[PDB]
């Protein structure tokens, strides 16, 4: 369970942010509403359940909306696949 | 101990690749000889001890030469710092 590059292609099952806070499901609008990055706005980004994803190829890598009421989003720690 | 972006500015003290192999010192020429990426070729990149670094700002983030005589180099796992 690892990514290549910035992980725009990453479809792994990591669900935890770098602080320990779980991800919010992409389909959920609670605790956090989100007008962007829903499974309907980004249908080919693999926004399934609450997996860490990088739908916009952010320089920071895979992230998610967090269940922390006070923090909207955060990065996840998804390792780089070992070099061949 | 975390980075921003692709980790070109990361100056932490992580020293293990994603497989758990201790990194080789940048100054060292064993177990792997390397004429590029030493403290005396990239003096502004913080190629110190065997700390994971991204001197060229490669998409895959921080890496190092490895102490594994059969693996030249590999990525390290340096987490993005928590989002501000």
Swiss-Prot record, chains A, B:
Disulfide bonds join 2-81, 23-64, 52-76. Residues 2-81 form the Kringle domain. It comes from the Eukaryota. This is Plasmin heavy chain A, short form. It comes from Homo sapiens. The gene is PLG. The chain holds residues 480 to 563 of 810 of the full protein.
């Amino acid at each position: 369970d690892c990514m290549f590059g910035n992980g725009k292609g990453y479809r792994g099952k990591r669900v935890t942010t770098v602080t320990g806070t779980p991800c919010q499901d992409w389909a959920a609008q609670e605790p956090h509403r989100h007008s962007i990055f829903t499974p309907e706005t980004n249908p080919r980004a693999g926004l399934e359940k609450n997996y860490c994803r990088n739908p916009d190829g952010d320089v920071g890598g895979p992230w998610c909306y967090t269940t922390n009421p006070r923090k909207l989003y955060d990065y996840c720690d998804v390792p780089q696949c070992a070099a061949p």
